[PDB]
Design a protein around this ligand. Sequence first.
Ligand SMILES: [Mg+2]
Ligand code: NA
Lengths: 133, 133, 133
Amino acid sequence: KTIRKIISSPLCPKPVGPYNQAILVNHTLYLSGILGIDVKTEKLVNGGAVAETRQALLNMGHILKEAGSNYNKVIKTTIFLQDINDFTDVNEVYKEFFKENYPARSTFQVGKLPMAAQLEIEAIAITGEVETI
Amino acid sequence: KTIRKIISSPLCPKPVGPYNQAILVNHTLYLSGILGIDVKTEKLVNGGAVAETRQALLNMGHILKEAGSNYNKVIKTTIFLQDINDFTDVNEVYKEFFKENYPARSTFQVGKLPMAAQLEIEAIAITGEVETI
Amino acid sequence: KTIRKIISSPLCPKPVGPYNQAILVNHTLYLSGILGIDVKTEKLVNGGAVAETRQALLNMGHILKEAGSNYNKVIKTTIFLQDINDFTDVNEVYKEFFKENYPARSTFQVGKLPMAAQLEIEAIAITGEVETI
Ligand SMILES: [Mg+2]
Ligand code: NA
């Protein structure tokens, strides 16, 4: 049998809808795309792409920790941008969170994001013990 | 070894390029993106985003059943929209299919979809027995 | 324990920033999105979508082989296009590399790609022995 666990953290925003913040399948954690929402206001943080990146990655950490993962167990990220010219600024914030054994990554500019956001970040991570060889 | 199975249903629109409808690896099913095509016509259903979402999710059910999965064993979906303003409507259709243990999800507006479609959905699901906690 | 391997092929452009070419988790290989970059010039190959598809898929083969995979062990690809009207030409190049047991796939047009590329291709693959039933 496969072990599925529904992952939720009240520290990470959860706008209404038929989705879960993350789903754990054995040791592989599939995270929903994260916007830079302030959990208190339920709105995007002010300040644009830098602030939204930072907020999204802080929010992500609550989901990773709830599942028994962490930033240094993230396998792959996808960065959806409203504007490819924000990449440099987004990547500088990304380096605040990802310091070693860096994830695989894809990045592109989309047509639009929900909530008129400047980005959205999706990730896959590993839970439990990880030997990096 | 890893067991791979090619998944094919004649009830889901057949591939119009060098791809399979889905690939099963052990118990993880990787679905290709699905459009709201009626296999009886080789065309999108009429009526725009709502109709197309419903037909895409019916199509998905054929693939899931062929592989030994189902909607309640879907792990992650990605919804590609031609217009972000269809999101609420697409979500209402989505809830006709996904009732519990909801998948992780990401949603965004693309530049263009194949067939000038309004909606495309890709998914990852689990086959066989699933114990949910 | 989950075994993670950091994949780095010297026959492909070395990561400049906080990402890796691919991450191997047990026998599942998560590839970064690949652009059609010439490893020597660190610039896209000239000639547009056809040339960039060929170079991207040549780069993918370097990364797959470094990890112990190959094209016939790719599970799923995603093709990010600058122009959906390139699909027919991209598919003709894709068929140079993928011959049998075709991956699942999604293809769509984005707003913009890094480096003003015409194409980016991401993949998931299997390492080690694979039995196709
Ligand atoms: Mg701006
Ligand atoms: Na800014």
